[PDB]
Amino acid sequence: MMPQWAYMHIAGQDASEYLSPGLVQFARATDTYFSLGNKFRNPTVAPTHD
Amino acid sequence: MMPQWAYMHIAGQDASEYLSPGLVQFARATDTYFSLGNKFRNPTVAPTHD
Amino acid sequence: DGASVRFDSVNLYATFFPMAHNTASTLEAMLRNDTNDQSFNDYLSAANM
């Protein structure tokens, strides 16, 4: 509800970090029969200052 | 049935697991000149009950 | 130039992985939880004017 840019996954954590660990295990274990990977946003922010 | 299948490498261990580790090291170390990889079976069993 | 079309019927087809009933139920319980919302971009996203 509260975060905005990180809630819509435009910035911050990876799917490997925001999803509950039970689901991350389940994905890795089933990824060749039924792949969930295309269903979660991974943000990719550019480097800014240096 | 299983020792027959584990002995003819239809099920069980990978070549990286049944071969003596000296041969596994030798293989990796010479694999760009003279490649021993195609000479050993790797089984690939499917997930069964769940 | 006289072209025409008529539609006799529309049907929706869907295909399910025949996943073990307790495995699928385990996957469901994980996906109903707010940490695990699915999310997607317009795949070549812009405001078109």
Binding site: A29, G37, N38, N42, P43 | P47 | -
Partner: peptide, 16 residues
């Protein structure tokens, strides 16, 4: 513009 980035392991059914 999209960001597919995942990997998998040995032939298990799912979680432990």
């Amino acid at each position: 513009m999209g960001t597919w980035n995942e990997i998998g392991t040995s032939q298990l059914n799912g979680g432990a």
